[PDB]
Amino acid sequence: ALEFSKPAAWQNNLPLTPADKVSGYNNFYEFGLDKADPAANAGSLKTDPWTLKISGEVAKPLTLDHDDLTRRFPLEERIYRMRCVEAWSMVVPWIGFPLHKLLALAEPTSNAKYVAFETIYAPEQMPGQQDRFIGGGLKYPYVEGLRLDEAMHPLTLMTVGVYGKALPPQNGAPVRLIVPWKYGFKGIKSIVSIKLTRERPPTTWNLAAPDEYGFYANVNPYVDHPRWSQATERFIGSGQRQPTLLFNGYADQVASLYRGLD
Ligand SMILES: Nc1nc2c(c(=O)[nH]1)N[C@@H]1C(S)=C(S)[C@@H](COP(=O)(O)O)O[C@H]1N2
Numbered sequence: 001a002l003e004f005s006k007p008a009a010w011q012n013n014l015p016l017t018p019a020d021k022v023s024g025y026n027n028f029y030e031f032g033l034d035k036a037d038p039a040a041n042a043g044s045l046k047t048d049p050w051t052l053k054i055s056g057e058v059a060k061p062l063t064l065d066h067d068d069l070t071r072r073f074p075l076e077e078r079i080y081r082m083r084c085v086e087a088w089s090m091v092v093p094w095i096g097f098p099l100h101k102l103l104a105l106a107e108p109t110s111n112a113k114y115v116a117f118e119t120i121y122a123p124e125q126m127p128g129q130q131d132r133f134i135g136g137g138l139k140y141p142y143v144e145g146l147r148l149d150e151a152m153h154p155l156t157l158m159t160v161g162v163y164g165k166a167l168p169p170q171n172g173a174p175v176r177l178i179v180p181w182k183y184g185f186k187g188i189k190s191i192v193s194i195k196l197t198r199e200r201p202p203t204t205w206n207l208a209a210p211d212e213y214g215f216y217a218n219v220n221p222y223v224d225h226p227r228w229s230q231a232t233e234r235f236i237g238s239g240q241r242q243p244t245l246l247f248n249g250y251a252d253q254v255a256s257l258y259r260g261l262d
């Protein structure tokens with residue numbers, strides 16, 4: 001349980017996704033393929049102590065411990081929609097601080113062009129990292145990345161809590177990335193490492209299905225997925241079809257960094 005402010009911009013009147021579901025229906029392959037596997041097995045993960053290490057193309061490499069996650073930077077509550085590529089979405093009241101405040105501390109160098117994220121590796125604690133089938137064929141640890149300007153966008157945040165309290169392990173506690181305008185797979189869980197690199201780093205779902213998932217993965221209703229239309233989505237409310245929005249509804253805040261490019 002923790003304190004936080006509620007900035008005007010991140011507050012709205014969007015129908016929330018019941019906490020039961022936000023923490024009961026998850027994708028966390030390290031704990032199994034089914035939507036219920038994470039909530040049923042994430043209990044085995046030891047999220048305290050913790051070590052989040054910021055390295056690479058940075059002038060001041062730092063390192064945060066479990067307490068730093070909730071105490072080092074001022075926490076905020078942000079109500080973002082969360083759109084998974086599988087075509088189901090939610091509206092979650094996340095709690096965290098913008099990645100740019102952490103990156104600013106580290107002072108990235110003039111050669112930093114990307115941010116590479118990496119999930120913890122603890123095979124005997126995460127069953128999926130032990131069985132090809134339990135784990136889904138992913139090459140562990142789970143890894144992700146963002147262009148520096150994306151990582152620095154005010155909208156992207158290091159999440160440490162949901163629904164007023166610290167994160168249940170199923171949601172990737174103690175630290176998880178959330179990039180609202182992109183498909184869920186970009187929001188890497190239980191981050192133990194953030195490295196600024198010179199080249200575009202590898203992405204776990206891109207590696208596993210190069211033909212289906214890309215690096216940008218910007219939520220877009222006009223571009224389909226090899227196996228399904230992205231035009232409409234299944235909203236997880238209480239107890240549900242609705243149109244998918246351009247940039248998951250953040251087009252005005254984000255169009256700026258993609259305009260005029262590939
Ligand atoms: N390490 C790790 N992080 C991960 C995943 C995973 O399987 N392993 N899956 C995700 C996918 S595809 C989505 S859509 C979100 C799910 O967020 P949630 O469970 O918190 O709702 O976590 C992403 N982060």
Ligand SMILES: [Mo]
Pocket residue numbers: 027084085086183184185
């Ligand atoms: Mo996803």
Ligand SMILES: [O]
Pocket residue numbers: 083084085086183184185186
């Ligand atoms: O996703």
